[PDB]
Paper text:
The human pathogen Mycoplasma genitalium, a member of the pneumoniae cluster of mycoplasmas, binds to eukaryotic cells by means of its adhesion complex, the Nap. In addition to their roles in cytadherence and motility, P110 and P140 are immunodominant proteins and constitute the main target of host antibodies during infection.
The structure of P140, for which there are no molecular models or experimental phases available, was determined by density modification techniques, starting with a mask derived from the sub-tomogram-averaged map of the whole Nap obtained by cryo-electron tomography (cryo-ET). With four heterodimers in the asymmetric unit, the P140–P110N crystals were refined at 2.65 Å resolution to a final model with agreement R and Rfree factors of 18.7 and 22.4, respectively. The binding site for the sialylated oligosaccharides, identified in the structure of P1106, is located at the interface between P140 and P110 in the crystal structure of the P140–P110N complex. Interaction of the two subunits changes the position of the sialic binding β-hairpin while the interfering loop (P140 residues 807–827) inserts into the binding pocket of P110N, sterically interfering with the binding of oligosaccharides to the complex. In agreement with this, surface plasmon resonance analysis shows that, in solution, sialylated compounds 3SL and 6SL (neuraminic acid forming an α2–3 or an α2–6 linkage to a lactose monosaccharide, respectively), which bind to P110 alone, do not bind either to P140 alone or to P140–P110 complexes. The structure of the P140–P110N complex suggests that P110 residues Gln460–Asp461, from the binding β-hairpin, and Arg600, close to the receptor-binding site, play an important role in the interaction with P140.
Residue numbers in the entry:
A (entry chain B): 59 to 105, 108 to 227, 232 to 782, 789 to 1089, 1097 to 1159, 1164 to 1258
B (entry chain A): 27 to 118, 121 to 255, 261 to 412, 416 to 817
C (entry chain H): 1308 to 1350
D (entry chain B): 1308 to 1349
The structure:
């Protein structure tokens, strides 16, 4: 029980807990304490023996090798006693009264039963990682215990703890299935039949264009077959390229990744899970410590509470048509396929295919597919996923909740373990009785609506009755910010990168988008490869062969192009949409030419937030890693009120067949004997970053710098002068939007100024220099011989009654289709979107946005700034805008220049790495990283600054939330302070140095860094935390004039990597670092980083916001440009550093003092002259 | 001890241990010295005494267009059964004894009021079974058809100046809806039919009472017979539904409009330290209300105050003009061109959410029942003959953002302007321009005008009408639907929903004892119609959820091509998928206004906080008040919407609840929680297709809680910039089998449910976890 | 208990034979002891 | 305890830096807690 000097403080990597500020009657601190002994080798423990007999063998070894405790400190930070469970000889529980209230005297201490707590032998050797205190019950605390194994996870043998990806020539495409599907000659009756005639029923307009396709579905009578089932029709089959090219987890996963322990294993092996022990503590008493209840955090309590749709995640509510479309397109099926997220599956990558989806698929008779059958692939909660959900306790009333940590305990370079839900231990009868449960965040966040945020809108955070959106977090913490309970950190959104669908015949030329949909490329960012997209991602396989040749430009199914999109004219709508009337047993595929770019695609088929809860008709997939910042105010009394078990109804299940699925409703009345709807509105409000939307946000992204450089994305301070990466203001040319599309009712509608001028941005299209307001139909898409598209052709015309036969296309079109296009007037031509902006914020802070590369720094393959990069000739190939391959939402050249890939921004001697839009021969490019290894899971301690503000360490930045609790008009609501240590910024494992962040007595949050604690990588390509398997890009030679008038055309890139040796070498982070002059430590010290000095008026951007004279985006760009040299005024700056001697391990924080490593404890000068009168006198 | 209403006249008290007090079942109708035709309408507790509202099923009221005393009870056939408010007290067990008895006499009528009433016409009440297509009426004449005539196209540009529609870009803008078809419109002396058309654009006789009684009623009776053998292809029989919303009958035939107006107008009760206030129900409009001074003599006649005399604050001066300019035409020139706007009256009827009292203040809320003029010419003749003159008043796309600028926008102030406009790659039904604004630049100011030709100014008769829904224009067109579902959004960088200021208007406010005394003086004024002024009121555009209709999935500026299609643009086209016990998905409903004092402490020296909640189609609304002034909560910035109103969407669980079965709203002072009790036994016995109902058993209870940062909590919260909200959540108390008697809120931690499954009573004790219930089977005694 | 608002009492009577104050045994059918609480008899 | 005539107290001081009450840790050798027993120390 006595303080053991050999045990010093420490911080657990998953929750960043080091010590608890104890308040009330007996204040002080409860901090973690451990033996810092070396001479430990896990190698001795030999691997036949399965994962579990081996782990207990490691446990028994570690038990006699490591010592852990939670020592209590007084208010002055002086230690008092130890509490070491392993050294506890004959422990005791509290003597409870007649009402369960423990017997206690302030002086004598607590009454002891003499009997040891429950399951003591299994918890005896567990490591305490967190301590929380009761809000209303005095002397009541709770410890979070984990097994010693959980701490030594990465030090276990490589045969047992594996990577989810591959280790003579290197080719990134070898593990990818790229061979596009083909026409099935046998299944030619499985083609969707054109209708005979439209319906008139008070309509009038007519067209010569091909009639709509009909999709009929009839039930009839047969237990296992439907009368009609046209969504099951599939006139295509996989390619036979020396075998059937499909997803086979057996062929493709030889040494398949599987978790350390299965869900069942952890729940039955009580020493291998996490435990919560309630205990009693009164330091200035004889019996100071006593134990209470020991509760095991059972994973099955969470799994039993998962929505029913999670038992079958290789399927979704669209049923068989979407399974078929995605399957053939060599994509993952469902909403959470194990090939993308193996961390939540007990049999890991063994199940990483589209086979056995829980519903009959690929039957010899198509009208048999869609019917419910047997599955064995449900979302579960194994070892890695489980311990990531361990950390961040909160005591609210008679309950203790665990919201989980960042997942750094079990996180590998190619794996993303995160917290799926919240655990609750509800205590009863004066804490003598306890009940354990778990609730998934998917349910808890079901009530999200756009009105709850002051920042970006229509973010992919929506869901439905089947809980398809599976939010998972990298939790910072859960703390009371004044009155408001706040849960912060980063969050996994719905998928946006694979929302567009490729035309069956384009797979080979769009390798990155295929990779992404196949779980090979774990990237969450939208890549700009749009030529091969299908006009609509919801077109069934039956409609794909309608225009095989492509001469009639397939009205129902064609290559997406917003130029050949139709009018919204009443007659265009009458003739081509309203004419065809859907029934009870029939739906139509309209001859109407729909098409739009990234904004448009996402507007119709992403899980965007609405004004109503559970209103997402489409939830594509779920992101790999957390790709959004997140802070949300919770409903504390709903968390404490809600029942343990949650009951779902038949409404939360997928339809048993396609007849029942056919006339489904997005919302259904819950069963009276269910309670799942009660859990939806726990989030009251939420923030994903600064309080900005659309184009206004882009301006802020330019204003922030890149940690690796300190140089902004704007490149603004000194026509052949560099241009910004995320903004269009003063980039390109000024186009008059009154001259686009219908050219009517536009002047005061979008801009509140007379002049309807809008900056085109980089990579624009103009008729000529003189003609910059609208481009006439002279970027008219032609198709392969007898090529040109014909407006004024019989089909492309609508004749109303009276015979004025007019064409349906637009006379002029917007002046840009680049990855930067931002049209307020045309959503169909906008590429820049809110989901990308959210990801682009987090990524730029981590400094991990990839750049598109043509030329490495090597000899006979260099990129020269002069004569090769023309900033004035942005309209042409001279500007070097790829238009294919790069990150959507930015200007690839502007990013390379910022990254100092070319230029003097990173290396004095130009590294000559870059991209050249070739007018000579076919281009061959690859996306590469920055050289930085920051991860979106690099989320530290939640630090409450004041009653209205909070913040945490995110990568190399300390982010502060100024305007969330109580928002102020005109402020951005965020502060950013960057770390100064170049060795940490450029480290291979940069977050291994982070040792916790705390709020200081002076009122500023500070963070501990120990660069000596930096872990080195264990290792043709070498795996690092930011390593991504980017696929090659091959495009035709770029035009010299009128370059970007059309969507950039790719070519087959399946045999292209063989000539990219130099480029492919830059996929490994260490090889980028070397070229940038960051090769090796060329240094540091271990101390404490303090935030930027902030005043109440810091962040006041009100002057830059609003106005009609210049649009809000234009006024903020001029404002940020007038504040480039005083960024501290906006709240963007560098953190100050104080050097600290020795090795930083943790901090001991009391309500009076914060002592690093618990050093510097004093008597306190104020109360030295105050004492008691001795009892004798 | 808690009181329970056993039936329509008996009341039984229970101890806090959920046990009934023996010899406590009291017959208050008998006690109040009232006959068998009376039943208890509403009950409330003030100054420890029970105040009860009673209304007779046997009431008969007549309207005589001629004479001084026009609105009167029918003495002759024992129909002189006015409504009463009685004060009862415990003289001890429980032994009730009558203290005071107040009678609610019919309203007094002036010479000016009676000129509107003479030709006032009223829409047949909306039912549980009323469809979007029943409500739909055939579109009226377009602007250029009224002022210019037929075949006067591309002559608009040159002729619009003379008709004072200078620079008006909408010749094709609708002027209203035709009254020759659709839902019945009846005089106060006339009676409403039990039939409702399935398609109002085709079936129905509108205001033509004569054409219905002579030929159409007989077709209706043949198609839709009562109990079925019927075809039901043209009409719906809603006798059972009408009866369930309080419609009084002479066997099969309903009593005249005036009788229905009276019976429904005496539905809700509020009590203060000096006054007793009586208002109507949520089902049909209320043209008046009662203010009874508690000091009134034993046999004195307590008269109601007209809503047409109660001037409310609509938020802004422009907001009030919008409602008034559409009430009618204001230039008699004729002689009998009497409507509300001309006779200088205000909004004449409201669909009342409810009424309550906190700290001697009265709180009311409700939707404004649509009211417009209409032509009655009867012949060449006027172009607007047999048609209502209503239009869309939705803010223009080019308008300045910020609440104040959106609602004060001059778009559709004097006449119609909205339609269908093609914008870039999408469209809108709202006019893109206002003021000097055009697509070319500036062309001179845009003018609007009342749809009456100036040549036919004298030979035109514009009288008054009142609708049964918060919808002013029912004309079967695009804009009608976007105004009803809230689908009009601007296109500027910062999106905003463009509000209407005549259609789906939610009115709410707090009334002082002096504001109530003013109201009393206006009721007792003889000769001139005396005007009242309620200062602490506000209005807000509250539409139905768009997702209650099939075909609409989001609310943004950009509109998909399929959304310009007739099937999802007109009323008759639109299909409902609303689960809240209503066949329509176009008209909004509100009910259960209840206010309460916040149990959570406030900063020292500051008065305790109190707010109100009310249920609307799609969510819960919270009304925020400043206790230090007993006014509606407000903030400095005009760009932000009045902080006195907050709305929070429902989930599928709360949306599932049939809003027409609302029984009682309660509030727990110690919890700060509202219990909304829905009794399924309040369902009509038959559909509109006379098919027997099979879900009129059981109950449901919704809990409503405060959310957000509340006023005067600390130094920072002395002022607010965000409206504190509410949260509706299905409590967990529900049944499909048992028939509910009442719910006892036994404690903060416990609740008791009294019900019968098979005659015998059963006391169910539920465990309460801060608004969330789970049944305790152990607590069975 | 002031917080719980519970009162535990024992009824007593003065016996004529013996001047002593004897407890009323039939007072609650279980004995002379009884409790007075609101709804938190839910124990 | 009224019968035992014993008083158990904890000394608290108002801190200037953090404007709230903190216990005087050095009040007795053991801590801020002390008893006032009338020779019922056995």
């Amino acid at each position: 029980q006595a303080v053991d000097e050999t045990l010093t403080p420490w911080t657990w990597n998953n929750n960043n807990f080091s010590s608890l500020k104890i308040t009330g009657e007996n204040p002080g601190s409860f901090g973690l304490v451990r033996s810092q002994n070396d001479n430990l080798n896990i190698s001795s423990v030999t691997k036949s023996d399965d994962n579990l007999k081996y782990l207990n063998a490691v446990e028994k070894y570690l038990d006699g090798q490591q010592n852990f405790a939670i020592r209590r400190y007084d208010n002055n930070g002086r230690a008092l006693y130890d509490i070491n469970l392993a050294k506890m000889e004959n422990p005791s529980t509290v003597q409870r009264g007649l009402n369960g209230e423990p017997i206690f005297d302030p002086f004598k201490g607590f009454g002891l039963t003499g009997n040891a707590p429950t399951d003591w032998n299994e918890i005896k050797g567990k490591v305490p990682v967190e301590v929380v205190q009761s809000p209303h019950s005095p002397n009541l605390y709770f410890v979070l215990l984990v097994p010693k194994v959980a701490l030594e996870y990465h030090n276990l043998n490589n045969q047992v703890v594996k990577e989810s990806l591959e280790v003579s020539s290197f080719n990134p495409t070898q593990r990818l299935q790229k061979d596009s599907p083909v026409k099935d000659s046998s299944k030619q009756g499985e083609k969707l039949s054109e209708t005979t005639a439209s319906s008139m029923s008070s309509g009038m307009a007519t067209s010569t264009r091909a009639k709509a396709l009909k999709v009929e579905v009839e039930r009839g009578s047969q237990s296992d077959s439907l009368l009609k089932n046209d969504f099951a029709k599939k006139p295509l089959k996989h390619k036979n390229s020396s075998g059937e090219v499909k997803l086979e987890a057996e062929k493709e996963f030889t040494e398949a990744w599987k978790p350390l322990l299965t869900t069942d294993q952890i729940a039955r092996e009580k020493g291998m899970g996490a435990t919560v022990v309630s205990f009693y503590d009164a330091p200035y008493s004889e019996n100071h410590t006593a134990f209470g209840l020991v509760d095991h955090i059972d994973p099955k309590k969470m799994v039993e509470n998962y929505p029913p749709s999670w038992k079958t995640p290789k399927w979704n509510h669209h049923g068989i048509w979407d399974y078929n479309a995605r399957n053939l397109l060599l994509q993952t099926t469902g909403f959470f396929n194990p090939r993308r997220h193996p961390e939540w599956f007990d049999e890991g990558q063994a199940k990483a295919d589209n086979t056995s989806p829980g519903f009959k698929v690929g039957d010899t008779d198509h009208k048999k597919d869609g019917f419910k059958k047997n599955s064995s692939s449900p979302i579960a909660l194994p070892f890695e996923a489980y311990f990531a959900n361990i950390g961040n306790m909160v005591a609210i009333g008679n309950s203790v909740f665990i919201f989980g940590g960042n997942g750094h305990a079990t996180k590998m370079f190619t794996t993303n373990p995160l917290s799926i839900g919240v655990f609750r231990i509800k205590y009863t009868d004066n804490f003598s009785k306890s009940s354990v449960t778990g609730w998934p965040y998917a349910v808890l966040f079901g009530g999200l609506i756009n009105p709850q945020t002051n920042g970006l809108k229509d973010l992919p955070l929506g869901t439905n009755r089947w809980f398809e959106y599976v939010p998972r977090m990298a939790v910072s913490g859960v703390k009371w910010v004044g009155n408001q309970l706040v849960l912060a950190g980063t969050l996994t959104m719905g998928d946006t990168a694979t929302v567009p669908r490729l035309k069956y015949d384009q797979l080979e030329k769009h390798l990155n988008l295929v990779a992404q949909g196949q779980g090979l490329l774990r990237e969450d960012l939208q890549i700009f490869t749009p030529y091969g997209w299908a006009n609509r991602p919801d077109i069934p396989v039956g409609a794909w062969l309608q225009d095989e040749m492509g001469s009639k430009f397939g009205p129902h199914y064609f290559l997406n192009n917003p130029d050949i999109q139709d009018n919204v004219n009443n007659d265009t709508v009458e003739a081509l949409i309203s004419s065809y009337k859907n029934t009870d047993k029939l739906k139509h595929v309209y001859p109407y030419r729909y098409s739009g770019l990234y904004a448009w695609q996402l507007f119709n088929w992403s899980n965007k937030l609405t004004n109503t809860p559970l209103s997402a008709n489409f939830v594509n997939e779920n992101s790999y890693a957390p790709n959004s910042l997140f802070a949300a105010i919770l409903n504390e009394d709903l968390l404490t009120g809600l029942s343990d078990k949650i009951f779902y109804g038949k409404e939360n299940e997928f339809a048993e067949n396609e007849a029942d699925r056919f006339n489904q409703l997005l919302s259904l009345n819950p069963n009276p004997n269910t309670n799942w709807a009660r859990y939806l509105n726990v989030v009251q409000r939420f923030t994903t970053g600064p309080n900005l939307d659309s184009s206004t946000f882009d301006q802020f992204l330019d204003f922030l710098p890149w940690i690796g450089n300190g140089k902004p994305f704007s490149n603004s301070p000194s026509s052949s002068t560099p241009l910004p990466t995320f903004s269009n203001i003063n980039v390109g040319v000024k186009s008059m939007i009154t001259q686009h599309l219908n050219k009517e009712n536009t002047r005061w509608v979008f801009i509140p100024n007379f002049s309807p001028d809008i900056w085109t941005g980089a990579g624009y299209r103009v008729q000529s220099a003189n003609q910059k307001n609208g481009i006439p139909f002279e970027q008219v898409k032609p198709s392969n011989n007898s090529t040109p598209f014909d407006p004024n052709s019989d089909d492309n015309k609508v004749t109303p009654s009276g015979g004025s036969s007019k064409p349906t296309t637009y006379p002029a079109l917007p002046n840009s289709i680049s990855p930067t296009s931002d049209w307020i007037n045309a959503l169909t031509f906008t590429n820049k979107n809110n989901p990308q902006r959210n990801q682009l914020l987090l990524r730029s802070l981590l400094g991990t946005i990839p750049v598109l590369i043509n030329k490495s720094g090597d000899s006979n393959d260099q990129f020269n700034k002069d004569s090769e990069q023309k900033w004035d000739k942005t309209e042409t190939n001279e500007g070097n805008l790829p238009g294919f391959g790069e990150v959507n939402g930015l200007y690839n050249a502007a990013l390379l220049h910022t990254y100092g890939f070319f230029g003097t921004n990173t290396n004095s001697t130009d590294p000559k790495i870059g991209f050249k839009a070739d007018s000579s021969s076919s281009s061959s490019s690859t996306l590469v990283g920055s050289g930085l290894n920051w991860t979106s899971q690099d989320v530290g301690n939640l630090v409450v600054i004041n009653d209205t503000s909070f913040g945490f360490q995110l990568g190399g930045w300390f982010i502060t939330f100024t305007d969330f609790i109580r928002p102020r008009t005109g402020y951005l609501g965020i502060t950013l302070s960057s770390l100064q240590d170049q060795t940490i910024i450029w480290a291979d494992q940069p977050w291994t140095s982070f040792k916790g962040s705390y709020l200081d007595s002076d009122g500023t949050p500070k963070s501990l860094w120990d660069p000596t604690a930096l872990k080195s990588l264990p290792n043709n390509p070498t795996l690092s935390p930011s390593f991504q398997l980017y696929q090659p890009n091959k495009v035709k030679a770029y035009q010299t004039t009128n370059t970007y008038n059309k969507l950039i055309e790719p070519v087959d890139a399946t045999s292209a990597a063989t000539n990219m040796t130099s480029l492919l070498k830059l996929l490994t982070t260490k090889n980028i670092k070397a070229k940038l002059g960051k090769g090796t430590a060329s240094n540091n010290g271990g101390g404490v980083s303090q935030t930027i000095n902030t005043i109440t008026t810091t962040g006041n951007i009100s002057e830059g916001l609003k106005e009609e004279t210049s649009i809000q985006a234009e006024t903020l760009k001029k404002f940020f440009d007038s504040k480039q040299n005083n960024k501290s005024e906006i709240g963007i700056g560098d953190s100050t550093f104080t050097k600290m001697d020795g090795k930083l391990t943790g901090v001991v924080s009391t309500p009076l003092v914060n002592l690093i490593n618990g050093q510097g404890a004093t008597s306190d000068s104020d109360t030295e002259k105050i004492s008691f009168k001795p009892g004798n006198q | 001890t808690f009181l329970v209403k056993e039936d329509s006249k008996n009341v039984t008290a229970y101890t806090p241990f959920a046990t009934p007090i023996t010899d406590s079942k009291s017959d208050l109708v008998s006690l109040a010295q009232l006959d068998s035709s009376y039943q208890i309408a509403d009950q409330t507790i003030h100054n420890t005494n029970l105040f009860v509202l009673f209304k007779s099923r046997d009431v008969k009221v007549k309207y005589e267009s001629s004479g001084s005393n026009n609105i009167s009870f029918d003495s002759t056939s024992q129909g002189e059964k006015p409504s009463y408010v009685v004060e009862f007290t415990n003289s001890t067990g429980i032994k009730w004894t009558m203290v005071k008895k107040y009678q609610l006499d019919v309203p007094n009528v002036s010479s000016d009021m009676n000129q509107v009433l003479k030709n006032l016409i009223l829409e047949q009440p909306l039912t549980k079974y009323t469809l979007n297509s029943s409500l739909a009426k055939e579109k009226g004449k377009t602007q250029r058809e009224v002022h210019l005539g037929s075949g006067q196209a591309n002559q608009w540009t040159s002729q619009r100046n003379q008709h004072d529609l200078n620079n008006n870009p909408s010749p094709n803008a609708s002027t209203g809806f035709k009254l020759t078809t659709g839902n019945a419109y009846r005089k106060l002396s006339e009676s409403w039919p039990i039939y409702e058309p399935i398609d109002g654009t085709k079936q129905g006789k509108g205001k033509d009472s004569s054409g219905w009684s002579s030929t159409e009623e007989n077709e209706a009776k043949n198609d839709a017979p009562s109990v079925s053998s019927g075809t039901f292809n043209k009409y719906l029989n809603t006798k059972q539904a009408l009866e369930s919303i309080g419609i009084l009958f002479d066997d099969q035939t309903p009593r005249n409009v005036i009788t229905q107006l009276y019976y429904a107008s005496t539905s809700k009760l509020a009590v203060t330290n000096n006054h007793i206030v009586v208002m109507g129900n949520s089902f049909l409009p209320s043209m008046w209300y009662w203010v009874v001074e508690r000091s009134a003599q034993e046999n004195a006649s307590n008269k109601p105050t007209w809503f047409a005399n109660t001037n409310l604050d609509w938020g802004e001066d422009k907001q009030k003009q919008f409602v008034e300019n559409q009430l009618g035409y204001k230039e008699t020139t004729s002689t009998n061109s009497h409507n509300f706007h001309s006779k200088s009256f205000t909004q004449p009827a409201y669909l009342i959410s409810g009424i309550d009292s906190v700290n001697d203040q009265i709180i009311f809320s409700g939707f404004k029942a649509g009211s417009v003029g209409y032509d009655s010419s009867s012949s060449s003749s006027s172009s607007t003959k047999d048609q209502a003159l209503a239009w869309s008043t939705t803010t223009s796309l080019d308008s300045k953002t910020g609440y104040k600028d959106l609602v004060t926008n001059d778009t559709g102030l004097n006449g119609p302007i909205n339609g269908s406009f093609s914008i870039q790659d999408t469209f809108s039904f709202v006019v893109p321009y206002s003021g000097n604004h055009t697509n070319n630049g500036t062309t001179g100011p845009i003018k609007t005008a009342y749809p009456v030709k100036k040549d036919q100014k004298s030979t035109v008769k514009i009288n008054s009408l009142i609708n049964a829904t918060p919808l002013n224009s029912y004309g079967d067109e695009g804009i009608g639907v976007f105004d009803a579902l809230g689908l009009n959004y601007n296109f500027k960088s910062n999106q905003e929903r463009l509000p209407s200021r005549t259609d789906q208007i939610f009115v709410y406010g707090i009334v002082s004892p002096n504001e109530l005394r003013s109201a009393k003086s206006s009721a007792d004024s003889t000769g001139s119609d005396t005007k009242v002024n309620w200062s602490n009121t506000q209005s807000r555009y509250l539409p139905v959820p768009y997702n209650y209709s099939e075909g609409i999935i989001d609310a943004d500026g950009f509109k998909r091509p399929e959304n310009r299609g007739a099937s999802v643009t007109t009323f008759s086209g639109l299909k409902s998928i609303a689960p809240d016990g209503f066949a329509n998905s176009i008209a909004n409903f509100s009910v259960g206004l209840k206010a309460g004092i916040d149990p959570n402490p406030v900063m020292s020296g500051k008065k305790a906080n109190y707010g109100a909640v009310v249920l609307t189609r799609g969510g819960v609304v919270r009304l925020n008040f400043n206790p230090g002034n007993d006014s509606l909560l407000s903030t400095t910035d005009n760009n932000i919407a009045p902080i006195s109103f907050s709305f929070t969407p429902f989930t599928a669980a709360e949306s599932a609840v049939d809003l027409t079965t609302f029984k009682e709203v309660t509030y727990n002072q110690e919890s700060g929680l509202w219990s909304y009790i829905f009794d399924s036994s309040l369902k009509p016995s038959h559909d509109g297709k006379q098919t027997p109902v099979t879900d009129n058993m059981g109950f449901s209870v919704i809990t409503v809680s405060r959310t957000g940062i509340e006023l005067n909590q600390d130094q920072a919260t002395t002022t607010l910039d965000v409206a504190p909200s509410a949260l509706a959540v299905q409590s967990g108390i529900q049944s499909t089998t048992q028939t509910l008697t009442g719910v006892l809120p036994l404690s903060e931690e416990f609740s008791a449910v009294i019900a019968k499954d098979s005659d015998q009573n059963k006391i169910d004790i539920y465990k309460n976890n801060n608004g969330l219930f789970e049944i305790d089977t152990q607590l069975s005694n | 208990s002031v917080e719980n608002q519970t009162l535990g009492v024992r009824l007593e009577f003065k016996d004529p034979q013996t001047q002593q104050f004897i407890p009323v045994l039939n007072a609650s059918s279980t004995g002379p002891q009884t409790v007075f609480q609101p709804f938190n008899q839910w124990a």
